[PDB]
Design a protein around this ligand. Structure first.
Ligand SMILES: *[C@@H]1O[C@H](CO)[C@@H](O)[C@H](O)[C@H]1NC(C)=O
Length: 241
C-alpha cells in the first residue's frame, strides 16, 4: 500500500495473508475471507507454483512479524482458478481457495459481505484497499497491515490511462490524478472494499498497476460483482444437494 496508514485490530477482519513455504516462508499475496471455508484471491498469485503443499493462510493477524512456527494457519484443500485466466496475463485474475478446516468467526476474523451481480451498475464513494505490500515501487513487504482511501475511476477514464491493454467491464479501476496513493506488489489478491448503505462490501480483488501510485495511472482490480455467478457456482459443495 502506497501512501497509506497503519490499521487497527478488528478494522479489516476479512484480510488474510497468503504465504509460500519454500526454502524460507514469505508473504506473497493478500486475500479476503468470504465464508468459514472460503478465501477469495487473485489467480496470478499462483503463477509458477504448485497448488499443493507450499501454501499457508494466516487470518486474524495485524502484523506479519508476529508470525512464528507457533502461529496457527489454514491449509489449502482446493484452489479454483477462473477457467479463462491465462498465466502472466490480466483477464479473470480471480481464484477461490477452499480451506481444509472451517474458521470460527471472532471480531478479528470474520467474512466480508459479497455484492450482488446486479450491483455492477453501482458507483461506490467510500472505498478502501488494504494489505502488507510494497510501500513504494520496487520497495519491500510491510509488517503492519496498511489501509488507504482510494476513489474509483470510470472504465472509459481507466482505458485512456492504459491504451496498450484492454480494460474490460470485469475490472474496476481506482486512483487519483496526482497519484501517491495506490496498491503495490504484495497487496495482490487482497480486498478493495467499499462502505455502502452502512455496511462493508467486497467490490474488487487487487490485481495490477503500471508500477505503483504513478500519476494518472490507476490501480486495476477484478470486479467481484461481475464474478458473483462464478463464485456462487464454484462454492457449491461438489457432492450435490
Ligand atoms: C505504524 O506503527 C509503527 C509504530 O507502532 C511505526 O512504523 C509508525 O509509527 C506507524 N506508522 C504511521 C504512519 O504512524
Amino acid at each position: 500500500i502506497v501512501g497509506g496508514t497503519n490499521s487497527s485490530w478488528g478494522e479489516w477482519p476479512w484480510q488474510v495473508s497468503l504465504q509460500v513455504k519454500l526454502t524460507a516462508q514469505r508473504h506473497l499475496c493478500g486475500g479476503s475471507l468470504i465464508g468459514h471455508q472460503w478465501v477469495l484471491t487473485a489467480a496470478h498469485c499462483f503463477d509458477g507454483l504448485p497448488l499443493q503443499d507450499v501454501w499457508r493462510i494466516y487470518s486474524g493477524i495485524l502484523n506479519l512479524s508476529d508470525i512464528t512456527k507457533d502461529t496457527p494457519f489454514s491449509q489449502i484443500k482446493e484452489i479454483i482458478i477462473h477457467q479463462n485466466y491465462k498465466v502472466s496475463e490480466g483477464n479473470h485474475d480471480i481464484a477461490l481457495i477452499k480451506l481444509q478446516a472451517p474458521l470460527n468467526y471472532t471480531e478479528f476474523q470474520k467474512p466480508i459481505s459479497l455484492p450482488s451481480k446486479g450491483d455492477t451498475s453501482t458507483i461506490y464513494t467510500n472505498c478502501w484497499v488494504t494489505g502488507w505490500g510494497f510501500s513504494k515501487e520496487k520497495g519491500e513487504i510491510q509488517n503492519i497491515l496498511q489501509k488507504v482511501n482510494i476513489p474509483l475511476v470510470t472504465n472509459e477514464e481507466c482505458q485512456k490511462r492504459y491504451q496498450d491493454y484492454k480494460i474490460t467491464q470485469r475490472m474496476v479501476c481506482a486512483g487519483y490524478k496526482e497519484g501517491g496513493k495506490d496498491a503495490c506488489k504484495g497487496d495482490s489478491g487482497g480486498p478493495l472494499v467499499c462502505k455502502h448503505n452502512g455496511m462493508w462490501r467486497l467490490v474488487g480483488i487487487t490485481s495490477w498497476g503500471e508500477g505503483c501510485a504513478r500519476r494518472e495511472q490507476p490501480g486495476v482490480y477484478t470486479k467481484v460483482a461481475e464474478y458473483m455467478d462464478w463464485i456462487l457456482e464454484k462454492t457449491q459443495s461438489s457432492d450435490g444437494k
